[PDB]
Amino acid sequence: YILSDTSTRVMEIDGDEFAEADYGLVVDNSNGTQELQQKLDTLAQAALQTQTLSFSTITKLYTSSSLAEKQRLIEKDEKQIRERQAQAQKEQLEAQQQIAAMQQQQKEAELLQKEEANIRDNQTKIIIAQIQSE
């Protein structure tokens, strides 16, 4: 109840006997981590405006209590939107190109129509030359 799905399965990947300061994790109340916490929420507030982080994400940042989860949410929400803007640029590029394709397909259809329109005048001129000659 106090841990997540992924947090409870850590007990299986081995060595949890060994202290956390052997695996690179220390308990730190010092001016480094309050400066990193005050930076990481100011950065999120500057990312809330300019429509870079959703209102779903920032409330997860306020209820995280760990500087690495709230770091990964800034990273995750930037990659999602920058993927969405890059495909929105792509779909708007091909849409004007298929518009450029459908206008091109009809004007050569106009172009092929006037050449088949002309020859049937020309061959029927051969017919009206042919009938009275008998």
Partner 1 sequence: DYYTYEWQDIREVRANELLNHYIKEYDIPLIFNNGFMDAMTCGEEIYQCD
Q: Write out the residues near a second copy by the rule CB under 8 A.
A: 1-2, 22-24, 36, 39-40, 43, 46-49, 52, 54-56, 58-59, 62-63, 71, 74-75, 78-79, 82, 93, 95, 97, 99-100, 102, 104, 106-111, 113-134
Residue 34 interacting entry, from partner 1, a second copy, Mg ion, none, C-beta within 5 to 8 Å by type: none
Q: How far apart are CA 66 and CA 133, in angstroms?
A: 101
* Site of interaction with partner 1 (CB under 8 A): 2-4, 6-7, 10, 13, 20-21, 23-28, 30, 32, 65-66, 68-69, 72, 75-76, 79
How many other C-beta atoms are found inside a 10 Å radius of the C-beta of residue 77? 20
Contacts of 73 (CB under 8 A, 6+ apart): 57, 60, 61, 64
